[PDB]
């Protein structure tokens with residue numbers, strides 16, 4: 001399924017890239033860049049599926065390459081942002097010095113076929129983000145198709161209709177992609193996942209019976225679905241820690257965190273094992 | 289920080305040279321390729337924002353490790369931005385190789401190219417997640433410096449020879465796109481290590497400095513330990529490596545003797561962040577076994 005979509009997207013990205021420069025239409029170039037980003041996303045999803053089956057641990061990636069989806073998503077979003085910045089500059093350059101579409105027919109045909117390939121995805125807002133760019137290409141083509149302009153006549157309204165719609169499409173694509181950048185960065189910055197409410201989680205954690213303190217509660221998301229929590233507990237050492245460990249595990253299970261590595265430091269409110277020597281303080285995370 | 293700020297101010301001042309107040313009209317086409325430094329402006333803004341975010345304290349119930357990795361994420365973002373711009377420049381140059389393009393007037397292009405080269409070399413001569421971020425910003429400015437070098441070179445070549453409009457394009461026309469392609473190759477080659485390293489800091493992998501080949505051997509060798517389950521080693525920022533080892537032990541003898549030995553081994557390997565969970569040996573569910581990190 002996805003391989004056929006990938007080959008179609010690659011072929012038509014190349015086709016639109018060749019047509020836009022040859023046809024002198026920024027909207028076509030914008031759609032070509034958008035389909036290049038779409039094929040990059042498809043390749044990222046294929047790689048994610050491949051790595052998901054037969055997980056590959058080892059001495060290089062102890063967690064496996066599960067973060068590949070997130071890293072590829074961030075990289076693709078930044079790539080699309082840079083391509084959108086380039087397209088915005090070119091529109092602005094061609095907004096002050098208007099340029100004519102040399103091949104309205106070819107631009108129209110490539111836009112129609114790109115719109116068909118863009119709707120095949122739903123025939124099996126980013127999805128709107130690509131479909132609408134294709135329809136902008138078409139729109140410009142008809143404006144240059146019906147009521148055309150002779151090859152030896154200056155710029156008219158028909159000329160500034162392509163750069164304006166291209167700027168609007170760039171705005172739409174950037175608005176759809178910036179939240180993706182924010183979410184991927186939050187995942188990659190080891191920020192607490194959106195679903196997890198660490199405030200009440202820490203309250204419940206401090207309410208467990210026989211727990212005197214709680215520190216170094218590191219919660220971060222590996223991938224969409226796997227949340228990893230590293231936590232340090234202090235136990236009285238004449239009572240024990242088994243019941244407390246079970247209760248803490250149940251709490252983290254209720255919150256959706258199944259990866260817990262509770263270190264039950266002995267009992268006075270600081271970490272009992274910062275490092276081997278006092279000189280490790282600058283390197284320890286969250287210095288005391 | 290201060291040097292990055294001064295670079296940003298200089299780039300702003302030179303770029304704003306197009307938005308004259310005057311009257312109807314904007315700067316008579318001296319901005320046709322002035323956005324080559326608006327890209328540097330954007331990269332500088334990204335670097336400064338990453339630096340500002342990184343300074344935030346490693347506390348609060350939204351980032352338990354703190355925004356220390358903001359510099360690494362900004363470096364990766366800047367590297368990918370530079371790669372995308374280089375791809376676009378390469379595509380434009382390739383389209384120019386098939387269709388030769390002349391230069392309108394070597395004088396103005398040479399003058400603006402010399403000014404841009406001077407700005408970029410002021411930025412270059414300023415002379416460790418911050419090392420990654422600066423490496424990205426310096427990569428971007430070096431990229432535009434190479435672009436300014438190629439525009440200077442094509443301008444001089446078009447200056448010595450007249451290239452009257454009667455004659456079509458000659459080797460002079462192809463001098464610029466070919467040098468642009470070579471410059472793009474150089475920038476991409478320089479940028480690829482940056483991405484390949486920042487994607488190791490992100491996309492959690494064993495740190496390059498860490499030599500796990502002997503780490504696992506020593507962890508097996510230390511007496512008192514009966515097995516090891518999840519040696520999760522990853523790098524938050526350069527110099528801060530975190531470990532999440534799981535360990536078993538005979539129930540009768542506590543983990544006290546072996547915990548200090550494990551911590552000392554990890555410290556000798558340059559790992560000071562270790563969270564050892566000691567799961568005893570008898571000698572919440574099973575549906576959740578699909579949501580773990582190790583099956």
Ligand SMILES: [Mn+2]
Pocket residue numbers: 031034114115118130131132133134135
């Ligand atoms: Mn499209």
